[PDB]
Every structure is written in structure tokens, then in C-alpha cells.
């Protein structure tokens, strides 16, 4: 549907180049060959990591917190004095099935370097080997460990795509455990809700157009990670639950304008505002899902600055 | 493009009914016949006014402030204690050429009655008989009069469509006059910027699709009101100017998801956030430009509540 439009006239020349490379880099069909699929996205994430290391200077260490593998990503210059008593948890994307290692660094590096903060990126259990709520348990275990060193108000959690879904689910799991809620979250290109509204049609997630009979959208996320979880499970789909929505911490919702998640994120932001939760929504016209894993455009740097700015204004400072 | 989609699955049954009423209310072709066009929209605004008076109980008085005709719109039994020291200025839409009288009450009534506040709706000079900056001068004259009774921090300005554009232009005119900036504004379905990005194509403002050559979009607003004003006039187009944007007050940007203005509002929100201005963006998936002139749907009431809540949180309270 969108292929009939010119590129958004808001875009930098650099973004217009990225969009052509994104389309050219599209995966072939894998037909259930998970090993071939994982190898393709391992290469994709390694390619984006090379681009990140050209732009940003960071140091990464492996750690284990409460039996969960993490990578701790810091600016090579060191964390700023302002951020000495803050930390972010990153939850990587990758369709709930890949993104471990380089995909996690691709999300953590630009935010660690831009904000000047420590980012703990979680190597959570993946589908299809593991199922909901495995990733919630993993992120909550990391969060529990960081509460030994950082006040809850000074901890942020963010993730992109599948990671934005898991970030919202981790919040409800933290509450289920009786832990203090995090200071702020980023649910980027995804949250604790099914895809809905117009954007999945416009992005072609569901086929539509001349002579073509558009089906209703599912009220569940189709991923194997979520199979058999009901739409009524407020911990799994909190941005459809008035109760879990009221308990959300301050939330940043960021998407591309051509991102299949954007209709759901605009509704989530309306629900957070009605519930009295501090939330912020940004849309980058013309850009796709999870666009800011491609760092070679001003729009990605701009996104990193909005993420850094949100955490810098919402997280506590004091030890 | 959008006729191939089902209605957004987020919409209430009432909104799906309003969407069909909107289609039935669409103007026939006028061939530049301004008299016929004005008569058509007079009836359209009178029809929406009947619907407003069914839902909301207000009282309206005519006044003149600094030689500008206004209507003062209040809840029928009086303004709330919360809002005794606050006032909103409304700037009606109508393509800069109509909307005087009933069109202005259609924007003022739901916010007066929802927030429980006095709304002064300005009968500003229209195109093509008047040109930029006539409407800025008119709104600034009203603002200057209200500063005799209300602190600048306690005054909000809002408008829809053409009125959102004029609201942003009135802010720059107020600064030109050496007056204190208003406490907050609402630039709804329009701001001080051309329409841009993807949404003008998806809304069908400009033809796109098989066998059609989609043209580039203009860098100026095409209205007679703005004839001969340059793109480089930062007072006319403040949300395209990094200088005028840093001086903006706290801003609410609200649009339908199918609104031709939505791409421009998402960019204006990014620019306000980078300039450190408090701004809030809401998008109502599946709804068109200026949807909330139709009060008979929960989504309109929800929009009125977001407008009231933005002014309630940003305007001062002190006498
Ligand atoms: Cl916002
Ligand atoms: Mg432990
Ligand atoms: Mg808010
Ligand atoms: Mg803000």
C-alpha cells in the first residue's frame, strides 16, 4: 500500500538511503527453517553492530545477575556524574526468537553512549524453546539484582519491537513479585498489547488492496512465545488492562510512522493519559518498525536523544 | 488508499456511525464558487452546533475586546472553582475563509463544558477579504484584553485545522508585540507549518495509486490567507523555524490517525521536544481531520478530556 507513496518528504537524504538498503536487505522466505532464520538475523545484527561501532565508543562486559546472562554496556568515556546512580535495563527485539548478543548490543550501545549511562542488556530466554512468561522472569531477576545497588526510581527499562512487548510484561511481573516499580520505561515499536488499528494493514502485515478481502486483525500477538495466553491475561497484555495500565511507570512510546505497531502505540498512549500515567509518544514519519537499529541517519540520532531525554527527565538521581 | 481498509478496529460503534455521517456531509464540487462554498459550510457548522447543544449545556455572550468581536462560552451554571482564574481563547477553523459564528461555537462549547472554563472564541478576519497577519492581529488584540483580568500563565489558546495554524501564528505575533507568552496552546489538526510527510497522500488531499503520478507536496500552505508569505517568515511558519520553536509555550498537538495534518504534527512534536518545550501528541487511529467537531462518539468526549486535562495540568491557578 505504502509503495504507491514517495518517501516521506520529512526525511534526510541519509534516511532515504537507509530505506533503500532496508528494502534490499529484506529476508528471503525461511519456511520454518529456524536455524537458517537465526543465521540470517545473526548476520543482520552483526552488520548493524559494525555500523554502531563506527558511530559510538562503548565498552561491554558480560555478567550474570540472579542466574541471568547480561551484557553491561557503558560509554568508553565513562558514565556522566549525573548518571552515576542510574541504570537502564535493555530488552532486545528479534521477534521473540533471535537478537541475542549482537542484537542486544545494537539496542544498548547508542543509548549508553548518547545518555552517558550504564545499560544492562538481558539475554532472556527465547521462543520457540521457551514461552511466556520466561522473558518476564529473566528481566525481573535482573531488575531484582540491580535494586541491591540502585533505587527503583533510578532504574529504567526499555526495549524495541518484541523487547518493547517484554518490557511492558516485565513491569507487571515485577509488580506480581512485590518489587517496587521501575522509575520509567521505553516501549519502542511495541508494548503489552496486540497490533491493532490501521497500521498493520498499511505496513502489509495483513494483505489488503484492490479485489482483496481484508480480514479482521487478531486480538492476540501471533508469536509462538505468546501461544495459548489469553487476551484476558492482564499481566501478558497490560496496555489492554485498566488495572495494569494505572500501575505503569512513566512511559516513552516511540515508533516509525510506517511501523505496523504505531496504531497500537497511539491507543496505548491515550489509555496511559486517561489513567493519569506520565507518557510521551513520538512518531518518525516515513520510517519503519525499529528503524533506529540503523544508526547512519540523523533520525536515529534524534531518536536516541529522545530516549536519553525521557530517562534523564523521569529517573531519580540520588543514591 | 484508505477506502481499501476496514474502519480501524479500535473505533467504538458510535465512531463507525459518525464516519458514515461524515461521508454523507462531504461537500460537492464548487469550482471556486466561494459564495456556494460558504453557504455549504454555514449549514455544516449549524448542523454540528445542533449536535453540540444536545450534549452540552452552555451559555454564550457576545462581547467586543480591543475592537474584536468574540463570543464568551461558559458552562450554563458557571465556571468551576478550579478555573475561576483561567480562560481559554479559541480560534475556529474553516479553511481560513468560513467558520465564523456557529463554527466557532462548535469548537468552544465542548471544551467550555468539559473543562468547566470560560472560552473566548475570536471572530477573526477571514480570507480572501483579509490576509495574513490579520487573524494574528485579531487574536493578539483579544489576548491583550484578557491580560487585564488573567495572568498570562493562566491563559490558553487553542484552535482546530486553520485555527491550529492561526493559534501558532498568534503566539509569534504576541511575542512581536512584547507581550508575555500564553501559558499553553492547543494546535489541533494544524499548526504553524505546511502539511508534509505521508498523511496528505493517505488522506487523499493529493491523488496516489495505480495509474496516478503522485506529486511532491508544497512547502507553503496553499490558502489565499497565506498568498505571497514566504516560507522563511518564521512568524508565519514557526514550527519550521528552530528559533520560533524554542520560544513556544507548552503545546498539545491532537489529530486523527487518518488526518492529512498528522505527519506534520508528529514532526512539530519532535521539534518541540528537541527544543525542550513541553509538548504532548495524541492520535486517534482511524479518524479524520478535525473529527471532534462531531460530539456523538466516545472518541470525541475522550479528545475533549485530553484537551481539558492538558490545559488543567499546564495553566497556572493563581489569581
Ligand atoms: Cl506526548
Ligand atoms: Mg541475588
Ligand atoms: Mg502528560
Ligand atoms: Mg516532555
Numbering used by the authors:
A (entry chain B), B (entry chain A): 14 to 332
Task: Give the authors' words.
Among them, a new esterase PMGL2 belonging to the hormone sensitive lipase (HSL, EC 3.1.1.79) family (family IV lipases) was produced and biochemically characterized. The unique feature of this enzyme is the presence of a cysteine residue in the GCSAG motif which surrounds the conserved catalytic serine. Three-dimensional structures of subunits of wtPMGL2 and its mutant variant mPMGL2 were found to be quite similar (see Methods section). Both of them had a typical α/β bacterial HSL-like fold, consisting of two canonical domains ‒ a CAP-domain and a catalytic domain. The active site of PMGL2 consists of a catalytic triad of conserved His302, Asp272 and Ser174.
